[PDB]
Structures are given as structure tokens and as C-alpha cells.
Structure 1
Amino acid sequence: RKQISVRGLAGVENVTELKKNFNRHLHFTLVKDRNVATPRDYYFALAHTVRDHLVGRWIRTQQHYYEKDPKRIYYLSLEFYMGRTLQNTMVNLALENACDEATYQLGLDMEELEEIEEDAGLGNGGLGRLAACFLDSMATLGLAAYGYGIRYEFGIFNQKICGGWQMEEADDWLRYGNPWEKARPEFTLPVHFYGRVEHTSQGAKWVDTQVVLAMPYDTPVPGYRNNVVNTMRLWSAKAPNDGYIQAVLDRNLAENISRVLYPNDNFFEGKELRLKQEYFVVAATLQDIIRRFKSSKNFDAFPDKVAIQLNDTHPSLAIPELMRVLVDLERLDWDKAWEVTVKTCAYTNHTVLPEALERWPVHLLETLLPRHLQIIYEINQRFLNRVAAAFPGDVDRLRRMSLVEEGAVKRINMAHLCIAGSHAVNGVARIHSEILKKTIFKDFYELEPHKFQNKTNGITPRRWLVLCNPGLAEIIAERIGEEYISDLDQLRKLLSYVDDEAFIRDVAKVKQENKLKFAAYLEREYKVHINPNSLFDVQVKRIHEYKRQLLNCLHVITLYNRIKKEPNKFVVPRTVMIGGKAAPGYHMAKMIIKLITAIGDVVNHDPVVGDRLRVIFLENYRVSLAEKVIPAADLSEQISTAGTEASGTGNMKFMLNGALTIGTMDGANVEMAEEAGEENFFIFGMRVEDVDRLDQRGYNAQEYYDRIPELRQIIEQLSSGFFSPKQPDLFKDIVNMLMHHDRFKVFADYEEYVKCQERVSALYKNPREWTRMVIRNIATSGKFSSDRTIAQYAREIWGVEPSRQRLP
């Protein structure tokens, strides 16, 4: 517990001070005594005590940026999936052992206190979590970086499983308050909606608007032991200052802008409220940017002092908004303003799936943001003039590249707007960034090849190793010291220990400890028992057809059927865990969750199977749960159809935490296998080239059904009601999709998947060799530190040099 050296020192005066301040907060802040005080009160007492340690560095860091005047990095995102903050703050400030000792002396278990904290679940999954890892890495790399987003009152819904179905409940994360944020009502700014354009004497003027106020809440973002504390600023919607009762109640309408995170992360829903959220962040943020620029030492120097990073197209309105401010308010000529805008803005693309692309109807933009639509049209005209000059007579190219899409509903393609208005465009993994240049944005790449870049995603080894897996962090540090924590490529040193008996022992010991603890978690919180002597086979990620939880389902049923066919034949015991939230309006994803639980209903109660195979659906998968289950995982399921997962980041988390990966050559899986050597990955299935070949001739699921007896059995089980005896036709939609409308070719990878899984089991039967392959994975996970990713953004896009230098 305290023996772990990576968790810092418990200095005698530090422990004494922490105890004093803990008690001070319990009294003055919480207004409690030890008589009535609950564990929650004790959590808050510790939270306030720890938060106090950020203040000096937070003030000094921001003062330092004012004095040193570096280029400022503005990271705009509609999602920040931050998780809990208590442990992270302690780790980054080297206070973990000290607080652990302080709380122990007060008769309290700090780990019990940590479990009281709610996730800041202000994101859906990978994209939101990437933003969070990026904030962490930017602070650790000493960048003058500012995360900007919306302070949703309700984050991603809490998932309940009831009767085997997902139920959504409001994530009331602010119920007991947020001790980490600092409300800044004094820095509230006006955001304008609707209205009309007057073109007059000085030029265009946006008038008759409805105002929604944006109140900032600032949250400290500590770097790893470098005394740097950056800021995440999240905007909250407030009704403007100036019958009666109804008028006061109607203030809720404006304030609804920041009420709730949209949970659909796979399908573009052209909801006006989402458009308002996006403009809300953009308008308020850019006001801050402009104000700060003016208070630093004429807009020629703007791109030298400002970088705006667009996390997907969600904040794409930053482009016309910056143009609007520069042209209409600052009175710059269009050409100069555009030069400035392009040099300021860069765009990160996160998916190739067409249904996810933001394409706003022009009528909606005209009504809500009339001036922005005007500006977008002018941008388009000038951009297409450039295309026409570069490719004279290529009319189809003009049509393909246009920001305006011409159908029954005329729309603005926000990706096209982003490319046009950005000096850099990046994908999030090598395979993804390459397909961007090759197909998706081929025309844009040909126009401006220098624009297109790759920035392979990463994860922070603070949250995703030191916090969640201190036991693994410790055994690593015992061999190679602590430098790896902010220099993850040093993990390659561990390759020298592939034959080290002590290290093999310790890697395996740590995994088993994590497995026991997670088993203890499921027993404590859900009264669910799992076999500790089973392979922990884990697929955790949002529920999507492309991620192919359905393929996992087919395999699980295969394992079940094989046991039933040959009950005497030994098989490696497995606990198959699948978790993740479905978008509320995504019927198939909700059916998939029900299928997982239904498979469990049969498998988990078959006396012939017993503890040889168990299938569990992990309820309410979220950042805090990922921190628990990933360190306990033996097998990481990364089984998206080749070409569909832009990068993935869960994959990296598993690799860092001592799990072996079964996966397709998709997203960052490709680079993970390259880093480790393919011999150390369970790679299976179609490559992108194979998927394309199938698309060329037409995907016929019937062929696979007709040729694979074991698949046929499963589909007939699903259709006949074997997994839903009380409602035989329950899974008809799943069967129909698989047989006739499967965009993701589940059947096409079935045989290779099952055979690959056989090899997983074969290796697990050899504990020594399993662990040696694990060492080969952990040792080569260094590339997937978000420090590496951010250093690349800094040097290749932002034009700033990262620094691990400690502030005084």
C-alpha cells in the first residue's frame, strides 16, 4: 500500500499539515464534526485539502504564461471525459503516500474515500477521453494550453441493466457539488443567436439577436511533478440579465444549452440544440482568445500567439466565427482575416463513417446563425476559385470539394469547412490518416498535400498506469526507475527482462492481484461471482455495430456449443466480460446488449458448463470502471471491421496494463502490433484490402451461413428462440441484419476469429509463455503515450516546443 515508491514520500510535517487541513475543512468548509461526519464528508474534506495544493502552482503557472508570453494552445472540444480527479491530483503532485498516511492516522481508508467521487463524465468515449489525456499531457509537457468546452449539467447517462436491457438515468454528477472547479461568474460573456444581418456604413452588422450568457468554470489540470497547473475552462449557459412568472421560468430555455451531453457518438443527429451547444462553446471561447491576445503586448501576430485545435468538426464554427470577429468587429479586410484564420486553425478528424459526419441544413444555419452562413458561402466561393485555378475544367472535383452539398435538403459539410479553414488536417492513426489522403479527402490532399498529417492517438500513463495499476507501475520502477512515467519509451528497457525469473513472477503476480480485486469489486457492488482462475476476456467500449460486439457474441455461443458437444474435453476457463453504453436512439445497439445478457442467462446457468465459461455484461462502463477492469484483463478484444475504427484508445490501455490483444488490422491496432511485433499479437481477419474486395463483388452473408455448420447452428439458435424461450422472435432483427444488411461483415471474420481465439487459449495454457508475451507488449507500449502524441502536435502543427522543465 504505502510501500509503493512511485506514490511518493510521506514526510512527517507534510502528513501533520494534511491532517490539520483535513480537520480544518471538515470544520469550516463542511461544517461537520467527527460525530455526524459520513464517508462522503471525509472524501470532501480530503478533496478540499488536496485541491489547496494546486492553488499556488495554478496562480503561478498562469502568471508565468503572462510573463513569458508563449504561443497559447486552445483545444476546443464538445467532450472532456475527465473521470475522477482526487487520485490524479495526488499522483501529479506527489501527495499520494502522504495523504494515504494522513487519512490512515485519522482512521480512514483513502481508497474507500476515492470511490465516493463521481466521474466527470462529460464525454461519450474515445474522443472525449482523448481530450482528457491531451490536457494531462499538455500540462506535463509545459505547454501554455487551454481546454475549452461545455460544462454539461448532465454528462453521459448512467446505465442501468434491467431485465437484461439498458435503461438510461440522468448523470447528476454535480449533486453534491464539484470541489475541483472554480466558478468564474465575473468572466461571463454574451453569446448571440438568431437575429439578422444589416449591411451598412462600416460593413455587415449582426443585430436583433437573442443573448445567452456563457459563465466559465475553470478546472486545474496538473502536469506530472513539474509544478505546472493548466486550465480547463467549461462554459455554462445562463439566461441574460434583462406573464412575469412564466418569463422567469422561460429562462430555462436558454439555460438548456448546457444541460446535457448528446449521447449519440455514431450517428449525426442534426438537432438545433446541438448546433447551439457547438456555437456556444465557439463564440465564448473565441472571445476569451481575442481578449487574451489583446492583453499580451496588429492581427498579423495572431497566429504566432494563438493556435486553435478543432477536436473533430464539432467546434468547426470557430472558422466562420473568427472570420466574423476579424472582419465585422475588428474591421480587417477579408483576405488578411482569412490568412490569419487558416494559420490559427487546425482540424483533427476522428472517423470515416459517413453517418457520423456533421452536415447542417443551410436553412437551420440561416435562421440560427445568418452571418455565419453568409461567411461560409463566401469562404466556399473563394475556396472553389482556388480549386478551379489549380484544376481548370474539373467540374466534378468542384462539386465533390464544395462546402455546400446540393440534395433535397441543402447542407454545409462541416469537414470541408474545416479543411478549407485549417493549415493542418490530421487523422488519429497511421492507417486512418493514410485513408484520408487516399480516398475520403483525396481531392483536398491533391490541392494541398502539405496540409495532411498523422497524429497517432495516445493515452496518459499517469491515469492509465500509475493511478489504475500502481502494482505494475511499482515493479517496472523497481527495475528501470521512475523516468518512464513521463518518458514512456523507456519501457523498451523491459525487453531485457523477458527471461528474468523475478520479473516474470512479478508481472504475473500483479495481474492476479488485479484480477482478485476486480472479482472483489463485482462481488461487493453487484453480488456477482466470477471465477478467479479463469481467463478474463474483456471487450469494453461503446456498443456499435462496427465494433462488433456481435462477433464476440458468436464466439461466446461457439464456446458454449463446443462444450455441450464435448463436455469431457478440457477448455481454458473464461470469464467473458462485455461492457459499454448504447446510444439511446440506436435500436440495434440496445438489442445487442439484450443479446449479451440473454446469452449469459443460458450459459451462466447450464450445469454442464458451470465455471468453465461465464458471460457477464459490465454495467455502466465509464472511466472509473475502465480503471478497475483494464488492469484485471487478460485478453483485450479489439475486433472492429478493418477500416472502421479510426484509432481506438482502449486498445492502448489494455496493452499498457498487461493484457494480450486479439484484434483486426484496424486503427492503432496496426501500429501496436508493429511496435510489439506481430508475433506478440493475436491478429486475425480481413485487412482493409479484403473488405474492399468483398464490397466490390458484394457481401453475401448467406455464403458463410451455408459453408460453416457451427455458424449455422448459432443463427438457428438465435432465430428459434434458444436465447429467448419466452419470446422466440426476440432477436429477429439481429438475425435479419446479420443475414441481409450487415455493413460490417460479421460472418466474414467468424472463422478466423474462432481459430485465433483457439490460439489465445493454447497460449494461456502456458502461463510462463503467456507472461513473456505480456512483457513483450508492456515493453513496447511506449509509443502510445499521449506525451508522444502531444509532442507531435506541438512540433508539427502548433509550432511550440514541449518541455519537461519544472517550475519553481
Structure 2
Amino acid sequence: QISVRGLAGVENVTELKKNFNRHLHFTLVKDRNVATPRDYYFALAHTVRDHLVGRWIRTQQHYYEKDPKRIYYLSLEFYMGRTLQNTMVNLALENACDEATYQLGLDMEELEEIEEDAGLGNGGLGRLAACFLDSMATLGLAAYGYGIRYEFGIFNQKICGGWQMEEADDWLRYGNPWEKARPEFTLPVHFYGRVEHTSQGAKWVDTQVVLAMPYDTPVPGYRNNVVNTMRLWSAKAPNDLGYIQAVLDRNLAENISRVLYPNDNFFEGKELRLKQEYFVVAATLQDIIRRFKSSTNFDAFPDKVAIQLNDTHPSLAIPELMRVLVDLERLDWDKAWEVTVKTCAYTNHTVIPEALERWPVHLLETLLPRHLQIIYEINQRFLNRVAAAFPGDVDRLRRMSLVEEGAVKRINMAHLCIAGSHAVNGVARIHSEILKKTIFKDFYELEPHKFQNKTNGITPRRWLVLCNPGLAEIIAERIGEEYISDLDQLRKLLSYVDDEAFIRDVAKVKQENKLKFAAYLEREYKVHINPNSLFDVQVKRIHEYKRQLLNCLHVITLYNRIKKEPNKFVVPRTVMIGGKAAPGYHMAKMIIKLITAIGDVVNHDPVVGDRLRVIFLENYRVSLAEKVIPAADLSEQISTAGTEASGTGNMKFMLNGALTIGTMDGANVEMAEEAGEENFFIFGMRVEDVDRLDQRGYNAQEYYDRIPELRQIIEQLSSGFFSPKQPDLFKDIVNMLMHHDRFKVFADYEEYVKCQERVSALYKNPREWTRMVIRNIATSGKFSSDRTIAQYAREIWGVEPSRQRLPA
């Protein structure tokens, strides 16, 4: 139907229908009289999967022939979402399948909604891994994604009485047609035991063994016939144990890959989590060595292998590589260390202290005896280096140590990663600068060459073509289809900023997206929004640093002003906030309840009418993001300056036609820099302002006494205006805002409200609002993960990206 969805040839459609019926019959063992939409979704999925296998097999064969340098991306999270439509898009099969299903009397869009999201991630960090795999395949890199196949991903969020309830995400219930179990490649992982020191070196013995079974999922590049692999490990117990209990206790070993820890930017030192981290690391490294030996001196190891650590979660890769090289291969320490540093690279994702991994020594000592010895040895040699470079600087030695002293000794995994990696990067310019100015300043001074920046990005395939066909289409009509795999070309759209036709089309697509979402909202949630109002949306994990609370304050302010002057005109808005809170993050759960509570007052106030609506989007996940983002007008990125390392949701909104209101934080800075500050709604303290406020001391009371509108809001919360039956329900919120606000919500309130008035003024002028929108879209090319990946490839991994098509 639309150009970018590919061609629908008669032979292709005919063959697709044939294979669809074959799978429904032979694979699902069903007939058209008993089949359900679910059965139809699976028949189509297996049909599309088939077109993938041929390419998957020759791609891997190609890598065996050419034997290029291999990139290994280690992450405990891969927030994939659905893969049916994405596969059709990358294979140019969308229109053919749409026609083929149409002729079979089926609605393809209805079938796509049946697929379960592969929610093996928490948010930012995990989605980045997903976008990265896509870009790596699209750039012809011999890359492999390695992780854990959690049988339960991020929990499904339900709202009961305004509160969040967690439900197990049993995403494998009906099966996963995309993965291929490879039980023949199972590997053993060791735990516990003890260390014996012989004349032949150290030996790790009397260990408990857990098997790692791999499941491979194909990762298709964009129309280049390249299909890479994402290998996920599953835990299995050895078969060799009264008898019944021994068999039942197998679950203890298999619990390792049972569930994803639902923590976003927060560390929890639990033993099960440490086992998961070592489990993925140990199995992946054996696989890497095995594949390498099929290519015995490891001097060439770094020339054939690149290991990228997504945060510190897979940090044990460093001492595990040393263990294998030293203990098993028998290389001398110094040589093994050279190899390790040259193959490992580390990416930091946050600077907040509570997110930093610091494992108690007594834990590593019991679970991984040998690794702790190796870490201590790495530390000694590292401090000897620090001592020799900064003679007499004793405090520097204690600050840089990988071992933190105190009541309980801990291992700072971030320090371990810096020491054992040849490259350390932040995820946005301002974040990377902050890393060498503060948190890792001592390390930067010792080895300035290791620090780099690699600004995050998102894939234009899933985040434009797949979720916003209408926009991709009207862009293609004017500049072609080349931008899809080279986003910088969108810059050519700057020529149509005055084109009356384009302006009308951009505005038309947005309205259609809003209508479609307003409908979806009513269908699956029986809510009630006005498609003409401004869609003000803030979707991301619930966090105090992300400041959904600042957003709440604005909402209440709008409401109080309306009640103040009921018959005054105000731009209509539909404020949508969505996101999950970690199960044990009390404050985050309280913020969700506040949001729904505000909605209960505002949405049922007759005087407000349909001028203001506050909706809480439940179970925010990748598939939901693909729906709400294209329909948004205003993107809320209001974290306190210096806290959001980069952000990626911000980029998604920019690419889909929404204007951005936000602080100079993370990538917001580079976005505004790319679009021009006049085309962004920047407000609030800059990083320097937050620093001055801390030096002096943050006194929330001051803002409370000087801003009557703010005072009124706080008093309403305290008196129980938003919780009649529970007058003090929100006392924790008020107390935190007034006395223990680490994120200075009040400090940015005034400027935020003023800035919000200016976006309202611009929305009243449809033509000008849309022209500013065109200006944002036209300059968002830099935030394509293809650019990001090409920089990692050239500046860290030492490989050259390719657009060369692979033989079909």
C-alpha cells in the first residue's frame, strides 16, 4: 500500500499464502475451522522465520570463510520487544505478507498484536542493547549478542486502586518461534569450591556445576541479507543426585535464569544476581575461546576478538578471562593481562551512587574463590602503578583501589572495569565529561587515553519505519528511501520547512497517529481522551531523578488555575505519564498512586471539562512505546541536570515529530545543539547551577515561602485534597519534597511552569508549531544508532563498518 513497505509481487504473495497454509496444517496441526487469531499469528511467524534461515546459515558461513574480527556484546539485558514486524521490515516483506494475509481473509495488524514482547530488559540500558544488535547487523559487522534467557522478563504492571501490582511475565507460555535451542552446544559453569595451589599453578576444585544451554535468535540487518546471532543462555542441572527430593532440587540450579531483576539504575547485592552475572560470563567466554581456536598463541586474540561490557554487570569477564588464560592455558600473568586489556572495553551508564555495583568480599569469597584472588592481584599491580605515578599520594591509592575498606569490604566493579579495559566511554558528551571531571577523575589522570564518548542512538527501523509508517512515507516521497539506513539525509528536509504541502502532511500524519492512539486507549482501556488537545507525554521508568513529580506539580498548577478562572481560555491538554516502578522502591510506587489520584480529581471535575486530562499509561513497555511515541506532541525530559547519563526516549520523540521540553541533561544538550536552541524548550538549572546550590545547601522551604502557587499545591497534598478517605496518604511525598529532596524539584518549578506556558502559546499556532517540528525531525539524524555503532567500530573495536549487500 505505501512505498516503504516493499513490493507485493504475485509470485511472492502466492508462495507466502502456500507456506502459511502449510504451517497452519503441519506445524500448528490445525484447520481453518478451529484456528484462532493466535494460531494465525503463529502460522505467519513461522512463514516469515523461514525466509530468515537461508540468510542466517550463509551469513555464519561467510564469517567462517572470511574469519573477520568478532564483536561480542555482553549484556544481562536485551529489551527486544516484538520481532514479527521488525523482521518483515528488514526483509522487505511487509507489503507482500499484508497482501497474502489479506487474500486469506486476515488482518495482519490484528495478528501482530498477538505476539508477546520479549521484555528481557528494564529500560534504557536494555533497549540500547536491542538497537545496537540491529545496527551492527545493518552495518555488516560479525557481531554476537550474548545474554541470559530469562524465562520471566520484566513484570507486567497492573493498576489496582491506583496502585501498581506486579504480575509474572510468562512470555514463553505459547512458545517462541524465533529462537532455536542448541542443546548440543551446552557448556558447564562452576560455582563455590576452593583453590588448591600446586607446583603447576592454582586449581579451582570441588565446585558445584551448572550447565549453560544456548538458545539462538536471528538478528536481520536492514535489507542487506545479513543475519547475525543473539545467543541467550539457559541454566540446566547435570543429571548425576531421597531420590524424589534430589530430582526436585534441580530447580535450585535452574533458578539462575528464572527471572530478570526488575531494578532500573539501582544496585541490590543479592547472591542470585551475582550467579547470573558469572553464569552469562563463564559460558560466553568458553564459547568465544572455542570459536577462536577454530580460527596456540593468544597474541592474536585481541585482533580477532572484541568484548564490550554493557555496564559493570558482565565485569567478571575480566578476571574470568585472566583465570582461563593463566590457570588453563598457562600464559604468564603479564602476557595474559595485555591480552585482556586489549580485548575488553567498558561502557558506563550512570553516575548515581546507588546504581554502582559494590560486591561484598565475603560473597565473592564463597561463590568465586579464585576470581577474588585474581581481583586482589589485579588490584595490587594496579596500585603499584598508581604509587609509581603519584609518589606519596596515599589518599589517591585508597580512592582508586578496586577494594573499598570499611565495616564490610567490597569490590568496586567500575574500578575493576576501568583497570582491565583499553577503552571506557560515557553515553553522551556531558556525561562523558562528568566522568573525567568527577567520579573517575583519578583514573582519567592516570590513563587519559582510555576515556571516550559514544553518544547513544536509536534504530530508525523500529523507531520510525515500523512504528510510524505514515511519517516515513511522506519523508520518502520527497527525499527517497536512502535515509532509513543513513539518517543524516533527513537534513535535506530542511528545504521543505516552508513547503505548504509538506507542513500539511506532517501535521496530518500526527493527527492520524493521535486518532489511532485515542482509539486504542478507548478499546483496551475504556479511557476517554480528546484528539484535539495537546498530547503531553512522559514515559520512562519511575524514578525520583527523572522527576515525574515535577510534572505532577505542573499538572496540579494547571488545574488550580482553571478553577481560579474557569471561563478563561487555556490550550487543552492530555497529560500522559507511564512507566514501571521497581517492586521494592517505595517512593516510586507512591508517585504512581499520586498520579492516578490526581487523575481521579481532575478527570471528574465538571468545571475542567475536556480541557485537562491526566492519564496513567499502564504496563509501559516497548510495544506500547511504538504506539504512544508517534502520537505525542510534547516530550517530557525533565531529569535534574547531571543525573540522566543520556536518555534514549528523548531521541525517539524527536524522530517522530514531537517537540521537547527539558533540562540541559544527557543527550538533550546535543539534541538542542543539533536542532538549534530556538527549536527546543529548555528550562531549569544547568549542571553548574546544581553544583552551586549544593555548595550553599538546598533549602526547599525557601521556595515554599516565596511561591504561593507552590505553597497551595503542597497544602492540598497535606490536607488530603487528593486523598479524602486517607488525608495523610501522601505525607511521605511532602516530607521528602520539603526535607530530603536529592533532586531539587522545587528549584526548577518556576522556570518549568513558565516554559510550559510558552509551549502552549506555540501550540495555538498550528503552522509554526509544525514548522518547528520539521526542524527537529530534519536534524535528528545524528541520533541513529548506526552512527553510534560506526564510532564504536572505528574508535574502540578496530573494525570497518560495511553497507555491502550479502548474496541473497
Q: TM-score, length-normalised on structure 2?
A: 1.00
Report SS of the residue matched to 2:345: strand
Compute the displacement of 1:264 (Å). 1.0
Partner of 1:506: 505
Compute the displacement of 1:803 (Å). 0.4
Q: Distance in 1 between matches of 2:592 and 2:441?
A: 37
Q: Distance in 2 between matches of 1:490 and 1:769?
A: 23
8 Å Cα contact 2:599/2:613 also seen in 1: yes
Gaps of 5+ in 2: none
Q: Distance in 1 between matches of 2:744 and 2:131?
A: 32
Q: Distance in 1 between matches of 2:81 and 2:266?
A: 24
Report SS of the residue matched to 1:257: helix
Report SS of the residue matched to 1:729: coil
8 Å Cα contact 2:121/2:127 also seen in 1: yes
Compute the displacement of 1:186 (Å). 0.5
Report SS of the residue matched to 1:315: coil
Q: Distance in 2 between matches of 1:591 and 1:244?
A: 48
Q: Distance in 2 between matches of 1:193 and 1:513?
A: 56
8 Å Cα contact 2:154/2:262 also seen in 1: yes
Q: Distance in 1 between matches of 2:333 and 2:701?
A: 58
| Stretch of structure 1 that moved more, 571-580 or 293-302 | 293-302
Q: Distance in 2 between matches of 1:240 and 1:775?
A: 59
Q: Distance in 1 between matches of 2:668 and 2:2?
A: 32
Q: Distance in 2 between matches of 1:56 and 1:301?
A: 32
Q: Deviations over 1:248-300 (max 9, x none)?
A: 11000110000000001132100000000000000000000000000019100
Q: Deviations over 1:656-680 (max 9, x none)?
A: 0000000000000000000000100
Compute the displacement of 1:610 (Å). 1.2
Q: Distance in 2 between matches of 1:395 and 1:497?
A: 62
Q: Deviations over 1:39-85 (max 9, x none)?
A: 00000000000000110100000001111111000000000000000
Q: Distance in 1 between matches of 2:531 and 2:296?
A: 63
Q: Distance in 1 between matches of 2:406 and 2:542?
A: 31
Q: Percent identity?
A: 100
Q: Deviations over 1:185-228 (max 9, x none)?
A: 10010000000011113110110000111000000000000000
Q: Distance in 2 between matches of 1:719 and 1:191?
A: 54
Compute the displacement of 1:389 (Å). 1.1
Compute the displacement of 1:339 (Å). 0.1
Partner of 1:186: 184
Q: Distance in 2 between matches of 1:291 and 1:124?
A: 31
| Stretch of structure 1 that moved more, 387-396 or 480-489 | 387-396
| Stretch of structure 1 that moved more, 392-401 or 114-123 | 392-401
Q: Distance in 2 between matches of 1:444 and 1:240?
A: 43
Q: Distance in 1 between matches of 2:425 and 2:648?
A: 16
Q: Distance in 2 between matches of 1:128 and 1:673?
A: 25
Q: Distance in 2 between matches of 1:455 and 1:33?
A: 52
Partner of 2:561: 562
Q: Distance in 2 between matches of 1:726 and 1:317?
A: 51
Report SS of the residue matched to 1:610: coil
Partner of 2:576: 577
Report SS of the residue matched to 1:459: coil
Q: Distance in 2 between matches of 1:138 and 1:738?
A: 44
8 Å Cα contact 2:426/2:455 also seen in 1: yes
Report SS of the residue matched to 2:276: helix
Gaps of 5+ in 1: none
Q: Distance in 2 between matches of 1:304 and 1:387?
A: 28
Q: TM-score, length-normalised on structure 1?
A: 1.00
Q: Distance in 2 between matches of 1:239 and 1:600?
A: 49
Q: Distance in 1 between matches of 2:148 and 2:408?
A: 29
Say if 1:323 and 1:260 are closer, same or farther in 2 by CA, change over 3 A.
Answer: same
8 Å Cα contact 2:430/2:666 also seen in 1: yes
RMSD over aligned Cα, in angstroms? 0.5
Compute the displacement of 1:620 (Å). 0.2
Q: Distance in 1 between matches of 2:252 and 2:346?
A: 31
8 Å Cα contact 2:265/2:350 also seen in 1: no
Q: Distance in 1 between matches of 2:3 and 2:235?
A: 44
Q: Distance in 2 between matches of 1:258 and 1:201?
A: 37
Q: Distance in 2 between matches of 1:260 and 1:504?
A: 47
Q: Distance in 1 between matches of 2:527 and 2:693?
A: 42
Q: Distance in 1 between matches of 2:95 and 2:270?
A: 48
Q: Distance in 2 between matches of 1:265 and 1:516?
A: 32
After the TM superposition, which residues 241-390 of structure 1 pair with which residues of structure 2 at under 5 Å, given as runs?
241-242=239-240, 243-296=242-295, 298-390=297-389
Q: Deviations over 1:709-755 (max 9, x none)?
A: 00000000000000000000000000000000000000000000000
Q: Distance in 2 between matches of 1:708 and 1:356?
A: 34
Partner of 1:151: 149
Q: Distance in 2 between matches of 1:209 and 1:580?
A: 42
Q: Distance in 2 between matches of 1:31 and 1:201?
A: 62
Q: Distance in 2 between matches of 1:497 and 1:237?
A: 55
Q: Distance in 1 between matches of 2:632 and 2:74?
A: 33
Q: Distance in 1 between matches of 2:98 and 2:343?
A: 45
Q: Distance in 2 between matches of 1:781 and 1:585?
A: 37
8 Å Cα contact 2:663/2:686 also seen in 1: yes
Q: Distance in 2 between matches of 1:502 and 1:219?
A: 43
Compute the displacement of 1:567 (Å). 0.6
Aligned length: 806
Report SS of the residue matched to 1:73: strand
Compute the displacement of 1:407 (Å). 1.0
Compute the displacement of 1:145 (Å). 0.2
Q: Deviations over 1:322-372 (max 9, x none)?
A: 000000000000000000000000000000000100000000000000000
8 Å Cα contact 2:349/2:427 also seen in 1: yes
Q: Distance in 2 between matches of 1:805 and 1:497?
A: 31
Report SS of the residue matched to 2:146: strand
| Stretch of structure 1 that moved more, 142-151 or 239-248 | 239-248
Report SS of the residue matched to 2:264: coil
Report SS of the residue matched to 1:544: coil
Compute the displacement of 1:139 (Å). 0.3
Are residue 548 (structure 1) and residue 547 (structure 2) matched? yes
**4+ runs deviating over 2 angstroms:** none
Compute the displacement of 1:241 (Å). 2.1
8 Å Cα contact 2:545/2:743 also seen in 1: yes
Q: Deviations over 1:419-440 (max 9, x none)?
A: 0000000000000000001111
Q: Distance in 2 between matches of 1:804 and 1:170?
A: 41
Compute the displacement of 1:143 (Å). 0.3
Q: Deviations over 1:143-202 (max 9, x none)?
A: 000000000000000000010000000000001000000000100100000000111131
Q: Deviations over 1:11-60 (max 9, x none)?
A: 11000000000000000000000000000000000000000011010000
